């Protein structure tokens, strides 16, 4: 079973084996058994660590139930894949991904003094094609200031920097005006409706470019693995794939008592049973008890 | 779906668009008579407007019975649809069995006949490896783990370049 | 034997989920 801080994550997830374990947990609840008390302790580092290591347990069954739109025609298959990834993110506890990476910039640059510290300590969480375009404008404003541009906002030099960072930002293709006015909010919602429309149509364009870029990478990686695979004769392919499968089976059989090796061999028995069920009735597929 | 649906016998479909199955409704104010024509069988049913509202109560909740996963089935599907692209241009190789005769032998130069025989064996090697279709089920299992490690991030699964650029501009151009 | 279930088959099989659960169960009692 669980330690009951796992099981509060698995209530809203619609994955399969989380649902089966949580239905057995609710069945044990029905027969006069009590819930365990949530430990109201484990200060913020343990809270973020356990959150990070228990959101993996909801994204990782959730990724493998998401079918890629590899080589499909149009745009809307990528929108299916990216909407299903957004739904997986909302079921694993993460927020809307824009505000999630904005939260990460708030976590990384809480205590930065100058804009050069901002472009240093957040280099990995932003594109380098944009980070170089910001470091050049940082040097350009740094030459006229002849001092580091401090991270306040009251500065005139920071305003001259931001007026060209907005310029390179709209030069990249994202309209910075609608994004700043959306996340900065307005009072009357009828005047904010159009800026929410513009932010969302950019944001839909943006996450489709994200998911389609990952799909282009998977397309090229599968094409490269196949183009290296079709150069081999079948003797090398057969002995190679049988040896690699037997090596991973021996590696997952060297571990005993651990849960992951036991579940590994259990799912190996599942795929052997699936081959037997497709062999018994090739017109209907697998036998599913209804 | 949501817990409530708001459709049924109101702006409903009236006819069929195919001849493979024919559908004729007789929708009255209280009930409806759907006499559907389908092959050699035929059914004439009776549903009311509040009888279709009892449809979406217990939801269907479809799922995909897969061999390994739905992700790995999709990558294996793409590998098979690439092997079709390769196989279609092994379908346009010229026949050489029309030139296996001994009349083309002794008119042929020895080096060029040897290179023709090695070319034919090279075609047989290509065609034997491009139709090893049982190897794709493991060939896609090397594309999966880097992809699964790229969706298992510390921030969000579907996060990437341009959304991080938009939030970087939104983070920078605000007042500090 | 045959015709297992439906919910036994919707499980994505060779996902991780259990290396991570084992890492968490040998991490958090060792880091508290």
């Amino acid at each position: 079973a669980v330690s009951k801080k796992e099981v509060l994550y698995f209530l809203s997830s619609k994955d399969a084996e989380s649902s089966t374990a949580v239905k057995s947990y609710l069945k044990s609840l029905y027969a006069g058994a009590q819930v365990e008390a949530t430990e109201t302790d484990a200060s913020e580092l343990i809270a973020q660590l356990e959150k990070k290591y228990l959101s993996a347990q909801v994204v990782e069954p959730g990724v493998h139930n998401i079918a890629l739109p590899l080589g499909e025609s149009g745009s809307a298959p990528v929108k299916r894949y990216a909407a299903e990834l957004f739904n997986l993110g909302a079921q694993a506890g993460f927020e809307c991904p824009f505000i999630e990476v904005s939260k990460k910039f708030g976590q990384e640059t809480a205590t930065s003094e100058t804009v050069k510290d901002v472009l240093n300590k957040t280099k990995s969480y932003v594109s380098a094609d944009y980070n170089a375009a910001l470091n050049e404008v940082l040097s350009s404003v740094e030459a006229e200031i002849n001092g580091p541009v401090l991270f306040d906002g009251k500065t005139e030099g920071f305003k001259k920097f931001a007026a060209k960072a907005k310029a390179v930002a709209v030069s990249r293709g994202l309209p910075a005006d609608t994004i700043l006015a959306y996340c900065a909010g307005s009072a009357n919602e009828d005047a904010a409706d159009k800026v929410s429309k513009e932010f969302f149509t950019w944001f839909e364009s943006a996450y489709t470019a994200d998911a389609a870029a990952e799909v282009k990478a998977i397309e090229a990686e599968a094409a490269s693995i196949l183009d290296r695979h079709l150069a081999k004769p079948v003797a090398q392919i057969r002995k190679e794939q049988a040896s690699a499968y037997a090596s991973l089976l021996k590696r997952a059989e060297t571990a005993k008592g651990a849960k992951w090796a036991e579940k590994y061999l259990e799912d190996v028995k599942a795929v052997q049973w699936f081959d037997a069920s497709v062999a018994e009735a090739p017109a209907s597929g697998p036998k599913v008890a209804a | 779906l949501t817990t409530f649906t708001f459709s049924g016998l109101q702006d409903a479909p009236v006819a069929a668009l195919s001849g493979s199955i024919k559908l004729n409704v007789a929708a009255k104010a209280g009930k409806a008579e759907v006499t559907v024509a389908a092959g050699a069988a035929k059914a004439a049913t009776q549903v009311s407007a509040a009888a279709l509202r009892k449809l979406s109560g217990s939801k269907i909740s479809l799922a995909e019975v897969a061999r390994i996963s739905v992700l790995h089935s999709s990558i294996q599907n793409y590998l098979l649809s690439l092997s079709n692209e390769r196989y279609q241009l092994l379908s346009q190789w010229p026949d050489f069995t029309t030139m296996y005769g001994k009349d083309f032998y002794y008119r042929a130069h020895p080096e060029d006949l040897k290179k023709f025989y090695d070319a034919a064996d090279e075609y047989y090697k290509l065609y034997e490896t491009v139709t090893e279709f049982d190897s794709l089920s493991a060939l896609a299992s090397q594309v999966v783990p880097n992809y699964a490690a790229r969706r298992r991030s510390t921030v969000h699964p579907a996060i990437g370049s341009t959304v991080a650029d938009g939030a970087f501009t939104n983070f920078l151009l605000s007042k500090q | 034997a045959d015709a297992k279930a439906l919910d036994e088959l919707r499980k994505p099989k060779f996902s991780s989920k259990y290396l991570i659960q084992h890492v968490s169960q040998k991490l958090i009692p060792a880091v508290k």
Binding site: V126, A217 | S153 | -
Partner: peptide
């Protein structure tokens, strides 16, 4: 068909490193 199970967390948000579409098809046409 089974994969090596990796449990590691990608910290960097980067472009996904598209590979080069290889020269197998031009080789087979050659």
């Amino acid at each position: 068909y089974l994969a090596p199970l990796r449990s590691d967390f990608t910290e960097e948000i980067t472009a996904p490193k598209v590979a080069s579409a290889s020269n197998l098809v031009n080789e087979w046409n050659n």
